Design a protein around this ligand. Structure first.
Ligand SMILES: [Ca+2]
Ligand SMILES: [Ca+2]
Ligand SMILES: [N+]
Length: 107
């Protein structure tokens, strides 16, 4: 479940990455419906994923990204986590800010 998205899409996206090392963030964002959301709505999702309200999604929040969609979902592997970070971190600061998050989703 994730507010604004359809539960069945979220559940399908989680099933599609059930195997370790099968997560592909851009595929997940399409399947769960975020790639089809407005920029406004994508921004709302960022602030939720930023669990500590620091203004950035840090690596630990990427590792636990799926928990925002189901608390019992798996952690991303270290490989998946670092791949997610490298793809999104366009300014190189080691974190994902709101504009970087939207850019990955609305590409
Ligand atoms: Ca944060
Ligand atoms: Ca960054
Ligand atoms: N963090």
């Amino acid at each position: 479940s994730f507010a604004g998205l359809k539960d069945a899409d979220v559940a399908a996206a989680l099933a599609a990455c059930s195997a370790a090392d099968s997560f592909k963030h851009k595929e997940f964002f399409a399947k769960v419906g975020l790639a089809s959301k407005s920029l406004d709505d994508v921004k709302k999702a960022f602030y939720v994923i930023d669990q500590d309200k620091s203004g950035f999604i840090e690596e630990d929040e990427l590792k636990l990204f799926l928990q925002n969609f189901s608390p019992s979902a798996r952690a991303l592997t270290d490989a998946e986590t670092k791949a997610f970070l490298a793809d999104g971190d366009k300014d190189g600061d080691g974190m994902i800010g709101v504009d970087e998050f939207a850019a990955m989703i609305k590409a």
